[PDB]
Each structure stands twice: as C-alpha cells, then as structure tokens.
Amino acid sequence: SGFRKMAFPSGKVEGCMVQVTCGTTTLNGLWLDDVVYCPRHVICTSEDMLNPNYEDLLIRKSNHNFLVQAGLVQLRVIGHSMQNCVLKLKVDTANPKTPKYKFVRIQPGQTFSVLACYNGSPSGVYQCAMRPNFTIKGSFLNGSCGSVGFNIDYDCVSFCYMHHMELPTGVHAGTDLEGNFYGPFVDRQTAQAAGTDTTITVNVLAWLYAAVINGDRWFLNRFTTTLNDFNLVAMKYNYEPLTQDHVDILGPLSAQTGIAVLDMCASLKELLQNGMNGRTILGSALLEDEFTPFDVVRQCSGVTFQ
Amino acid sequence: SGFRKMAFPSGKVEGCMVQVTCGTTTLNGLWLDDVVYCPRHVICTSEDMLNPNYEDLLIRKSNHNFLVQAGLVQLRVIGHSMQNCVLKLKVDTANPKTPKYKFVRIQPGQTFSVLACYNGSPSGVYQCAMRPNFTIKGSFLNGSCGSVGFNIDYDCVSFCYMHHMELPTGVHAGTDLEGNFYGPFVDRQTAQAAGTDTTITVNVLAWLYAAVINGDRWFLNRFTTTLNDFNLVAMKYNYEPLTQDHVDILGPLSAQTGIAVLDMCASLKELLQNGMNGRTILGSALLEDEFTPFDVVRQCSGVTFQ
Numbered sequence: 001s002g003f004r005k006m007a008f009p010s011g012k013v014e015g016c017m018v019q020v021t022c023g024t025t026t027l028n029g030l031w032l033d034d035v036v037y038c039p040r041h042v043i044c045t046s047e048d049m050l051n052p053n054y055e056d057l058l059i060r061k062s063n064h065n066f067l068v069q070a071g072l073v074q075l076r077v078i079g080h081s082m083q084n085c086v087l088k089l090k091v092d093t094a095n096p097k098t099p100k101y102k103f104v105r106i107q108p109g110q111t112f113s114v115l116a117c118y119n120g121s122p123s124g125v126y127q128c129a130m131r132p133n134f135t136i137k138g139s140f141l142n143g144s145c146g147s148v149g150f151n152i153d154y155d156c157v158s159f160c161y162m163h164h165m166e167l168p169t170g171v172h173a174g175t176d177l178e179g180n181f182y183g184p185f186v187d188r189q190t191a192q193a194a195g196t197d198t199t200i201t202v203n204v205l206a207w208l209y210a211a212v213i214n215g216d217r218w219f220l221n222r223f224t225t226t227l228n229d230f231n232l233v234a235m236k237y238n239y240e241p242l243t244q245d246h247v248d249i250l251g252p253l254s255a256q257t258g259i260a261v262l263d264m265c266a267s268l269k270e271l272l273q274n275g276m277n278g279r280t281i282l283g284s285a286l287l288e289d290e291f292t293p294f295d296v297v298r299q300c301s302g303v304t305f306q
Numbered sequence: 307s308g309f310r311k312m313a314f315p316s317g318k319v320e321g322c323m324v325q326v327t328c329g330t331t332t333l334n335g336l337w338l339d340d341v342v343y344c345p346r347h348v349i350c351t352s353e354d355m356l357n358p359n360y361e362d363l364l365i366r367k368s369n370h371n372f373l374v375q376a377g378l379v380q381l382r383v384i385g386h387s388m389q390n391c392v393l394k395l396k397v398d399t400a401n402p403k404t405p406k407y408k409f410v411r412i413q414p415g416q417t418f419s420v421l422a423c424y425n426g427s428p429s430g431v432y433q434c435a436m437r438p439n440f441t442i443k444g445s446f447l448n449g450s451c452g453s454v455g456f457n458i459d460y461d462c463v464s465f466c467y468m469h470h471m472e473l474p475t476g477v478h479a480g481t482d483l484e485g486n487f488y489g490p491f492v493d494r495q496t497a498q499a500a501g502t503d504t505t506i507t508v509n510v511l512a513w514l515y516a517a518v519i520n521g522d523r524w525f526l527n528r529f530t531t532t533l534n535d536f537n538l539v540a541m542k543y544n545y546e547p548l549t550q551d552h553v554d555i556l557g558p559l560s561a562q563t564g565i566a567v568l569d570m571c572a573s574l575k576e577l578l579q580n581g582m583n584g585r586t587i588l589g590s591a592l593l594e595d596e597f598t599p600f601d602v603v604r605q606c607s608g609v610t611f612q
C-alpha cells in the first residue's frame with residue numbers, strides 16, 4: 001500500500017550522460033551508440049542567445065571544438081550535424097552502456113522521469129508531465145540543459161525530452177530527441193510566455209482511483225454525471241475536456257475498484273465545486289494530475305524493469 | 307529554477323539488487339561485496355508471521371535453502387547468519403558492481419531515496435523521510451520487502467533503510483542495515499500502531515526558504531517571533547519543537563536569502579494559524595516537511611554525484 005510520485009530507475013540513463021563543452025559553454029549530452037545528442041545552443045554565448053543565427057554560428061565550429069567527456073575519459077568527435085534544435089556529435093566509440101532505446105514524441109498529459117545532470121554528472125531523478133501548454137514544471141539550474149526525460153518499458157528506454165530553456169515564469173521548455181520543441185517555444189531568449197496551465201482531467205481521475213485502492217475514500221459521494229455535464233464544470237475550472245477515449249483508458253481502474261468512471265467524475269465535480277475542506281487525498285491538499293492511468297496501474301501492481 | 311521532490315540517481319543501488327527465495331517466500335536482497343542482506347522474515351510462511359520464533363525457524367534452513375538470483379544468474383550461498391532482524395547470506399562471488407558504501411542509522415526527520423523492487427528487479431525510485439514516529443510513508447506492495455533506502459555523497463552510497471513491514475494503517479516500518487528496526491516496531495503480524503505523525507518543523511522551514519529562492523514569496527509577512535513563542539504554536543499543531551540546533555542548521559539558507567530564521571518562523575506561524583487561503587507554495591497546498599536543509603541547498607545549487 002501507499003502511493004508515491006515515483007520515477008523510473010535511472011541507471012540505464014546514467015550510463016549515457018556525458019559533458020559537452022563548446023568554447024565557454026558546458027552542458028549535458030546523451031551518448032547512445034556512436035552519437036552524442038545535445039542542445040544546439042551549446043554553440044552560443046550568453047550574448048548570442050538574444051538573436052542567434054545557428055547555421056551561421058555553426059560555420060565557426062569544427063569537430064575538435066566540441067569537447068565531449070564521459071566521466072574522466074575524453075571522446076573523439078569524428079562528425080557533427082544540426083537536426084532541428086539538437087546537435088548530433090558522431091564519436092569514434094559506441095557507448096558500451098547503450099541500453100535498448102527508442103525516441104518518442106509524447107502527447108500533453110503524458111508523464112516521464114527526468115535525470116537532472118550538471119557537467120555530465122547525474123544529480124537527481126524526478127517525475128514530470130508534459131503540460132497541456134507544452135511546458136514542464138521541472139527543477140533545472142544553469143548547466144542542466146541536455147538533461148533528458150524518459151520512460152522505461154521492461155528493458156527499453158523511450159527518450160522523450162531534452163531540456164533547453166527556462167521561461168521567465170520559471171517553467172521549462174525543451175525538445176524531443178529529434179530536436180523539435182514541444183509546443184511553440186524556441187531556443188532564443190525572447191518574450192515567449194506559456195498559455196493556460198490546464199489540469200489533466202484523466203490523470204486526476206486516475207489518481208482518485210489510486211486513492212480508493214489505497215484506502216482514501218472520503219470523497220466518494222452518492223452522485224453520478226455525464227461527460228457533457230462534467231465538462232461544463234471542467235471548463236469553468238480550467239480542466240481539459242474529458243473524452244470517451246479518456247473514459248475507455250480508465251476502464252481497467254474502473255473494473256478493479258467497481259467505481260464507474262462517471263461516478264468518479266461526479267466525485268471530482270464535487271471536489272472542484274466544494275474544495276477539500278481542509279482534508280487530504282494521498283497526502284495532498286490539491287488534485288494531483290501528474291499520474292497517468294498507466295502510472296497508477298503500474299505502481300499499484302508492482303511492474304518492474306530489466 | 308523550480309523545486310521538485312527529487313531522489314538520488316538509483317543506478318549504483320540497482321546494481322546491488324538480487325532476488326532471495328526461501329521455500330515459498332520471495333523478496334529482495336542487497337548484494338554488497340560477498341554478502342547478501344535481506345529481511346529475516348524470508349524464512350516465514352504467512353502463518354508463521356503471527357508469532358514467529360526466528361531462531362527456531364532458522365534451524366530448519368541450510369545454505370542451499372536460500373535461493374539467490376542476480377538477474378538470470380544464480381549465486382552460490384556458502385554461509386548464513388542472523389543479525390538482529392536481517393539475514394546475511396555469504397556468497398562465493400563479490401558483487402562486481404559494489405559501489406563505495408556505508409551503513410548509517412538515520413535520525414527522525416532525515417530524508418532518503420527508496421528503490422522499490424520486486425523479485426530483485428527495480429520498479430521505481432522516490433523520496434521518503436524517517437518520520438518522528440519512526441514510520442515512513444512509502445509505496446510498497448507484497449514482494450517489496452528488502453527494498454532499501456539510501457543517500458549518496460559523491461561516489462559513496464550510505465544505506466539507511468531496509469523495508470520489512472506494513473502496518474494496518476498503511477504506513478511502513480523497517481530496519482537499518484544492521485537489522486535493527488527504527489522505532490518500536492517488530493517483524494511480527496501483531497497489533498502495533500504508530501504514534502503521532504508529527505510535522506518536521508526544520509524541514510518545513512527549509513522548504514519555505516526553497517520557495518523564496520524559487521520566486522514564491524506571498525507568505526512572507528512583517529512579523530518575527532522567538533523560539534519559545536513559536537514552539538507554543540508548534541505544539542498546538544503537532545509540529546516538532548524547534549531547537550537552537552535547527553536554527554543553526556538553517557544558517558546557510560538564512561544567509562543566502564537574507565531572511566532571518568525567526569522571521570521565517572513567524573511566516574510559518576501565520577501559515578499554521580491562518581492556513582493557505584487556497585494558495586499554493588511550490589505547487590503544494592500543504593506545508594511540505596520531507597526536504598531537509600541539506601536537500602534544499604543541494605537541489606538549489608546543483609550538487610552532482612560520481
């Protein structure tokens with residue numbers, strides 16, 4: 001019993017972290033097979049970041065300008081290229097610790113673990129979600145760029161995020177491993193602001209199921225609702241509209257607990273309209289939205305990984 | 307910027323997890339050098355757990371009754387002994403992945419990371435604290451016993467917890483790596499209940515400093531207090547008494563922010579008496595107490611680990 005914000009074990013990703021230095025800038029890279037992936041802004045000065053022309057800046061860089069270090073051992077760079085907002089640095093040695101892996105582009109609402117690193121060295125691991133506004137709420141200091149987010153299924157690491165930017169409001173933006181930003185963000189220091197931080201309704205419902213499984217049931221009520229009635233309340237509270245697809249995804253948790261999805265929606269509706277009245281659910285005083293249905297099933301059943 | 311509940315990278319501990327089976331019971335063990343540590347209740351049936359005589363049950367077990375498996379490879383058990391509530395299974399092969407390590411017995415209020423495992427395989431990592439009542443609030447299912455808690459300083463893993471028991475109220479009890487339970491708990495299925503779950507005041511204050519560092523400052527007020535006046539309020543709210551030692555430990559965070567410790571105490575006092583008024587601090591609607599002062603400094607400065 002018990003339900004915690006849980007990250008994937010980080011060891012398979014730790015073995016892939018390197019330090020990348022270009023001129024005066026040091027950040028992290030991800031070493032998989034014979035390629036190191038890192039943010040293209042490694043080539044910028046702080047001055048450059050206001051209005052960088054990456055293609056032009058890159059002309060002045062050769063393979064030997066990209067210093068790649070794995071622990072205390074230097075890697076030899078034999079080629080480099082820009083793909084969208086990442087650089088791919090070809091090295092002469094395949095990472096002997098390369099796990100089975102895939103590159104995935106996730107949808108808003110999906111969760112993942114972040115291995116925060118500095119100077120190629122892991123500092124901590126924590127769980128995030130891709131927000132509906134395409135930011136993430138991370139913990140990233142200067143030097144953390146190039147840290148990655150990932151999910152694991154058994155023995156395969158699916159990398160879904162590389163960290164690039166902090167907005168002036170303290171939230172975070174980044175790319176998939178093909179170098180395409182999530183949402184509308186760019187690797188320039190400009191006036192870009194995040195849109196509404198909508199609550200991920202299907203995840204809140206999953207977490208309410210987790211609460212019931214783990215003994216917290218005070219919020220269950222005598223009511224039901226419909227998708228359309230619930231969504232009229234979801235809209236008022238800046239919740240994502242709940243779809244039939246979301247209902248179907250909650251099916252297994254509905255079956256395990258015997259609580260119909262629309263009944264749980266009615267419990268959530270009452271929580272939104274009435275608040276918590278100073279009570280808690282799974283040690284939280286707000287409605288948690290960074291557990292997916294699959295996260296809840298995984299943690300409540302004990303799924304492990306090679 | 308940003309502040310997250312962050313666990314240590316788990317790779318060094320992943321390399322130490324094995325599966326231990328004795329008769330019909332399977333749980334996790336920790337393999338360091340040529341010794342595997344695991345809970346002594348591996349030798350019990352579910353029936354035995356009501357009133358086990360461990361010394362007597364152990365008589366019926368030989369080295370070959372302890373099946374130890376590291377991934378898909380079996381380890382040879384050449385000796386075994388009971389030390390308090392753990393078994394030490396001597397194996398004929400030193401773990402080649404043994405990190406630098408220490409065994410530490412932590413104080414209530416100190417935090418640590420847990421690598422939850424099943425069948426010797428890591429499932430997730432999360433952050434915990436030793437509560438003032440000597441429980442921890444974890445996420446542990448059947449088969450998770452033998453999962454460990456730990457801290458890392460650079461390249462050395464300090465193991466501080468091994469999981470043994472779930473109380474009927476859903477909180478968790480366990481031992482240090484010498485096999486001594488934290489608090490008054492025992493490895494028997496009996497009526498043992500946890501005492502008051504007191505809030506770790508020094509950790510709440512550390513987290514309020516983290517909030518200020520990261521931009522959340524609405525709760526700063528015009529007031530100050532004294533230790534004795536604050537503690538009269540701490541007592542009413544089931545907070546641990548704040549000592550001069552705690553004040554001294556907060557010194558660095560006080561210096562970084564320029565907010566005197568007793569001023570932050572006065573802010574906390576107002577939060578306790580008035581509540582949050584529906585506001586949040588670092589994405590929380592309650593006062594978080596599972597970050598230590600050292601955790602806050604570490605995460606706010608970017609300390610990494612070999």
Ligand SMILES: CC(C)(C)C(=O)[C@H](Oc1ccc(Cl)cc1)n1ccnc1
Binds near residue numbers: 103106
């Ligand atoms: C943007 C998205 C995810 C909808 C997309 O178009 C996706 O392409 C990828 C992009 C980045 C990676 Cl890392 C992986 C796939 N896709 C291709 C074919 N069907 C879907």
Ligand SMILES: CC(C)(C)C(=O)[C@H](Oc1ccc(Cl)cc1)n1ccnc1
Binds near residue numbers: 412483484
């Ligand atoms: C119980 C405690 C922590 C106060 C204690 O007595 C401690 O002993 C240990 C016990 C378990 C481990 Cl894992 C490590 C040390 N100690 C010895 C000498 N001074 C302090």
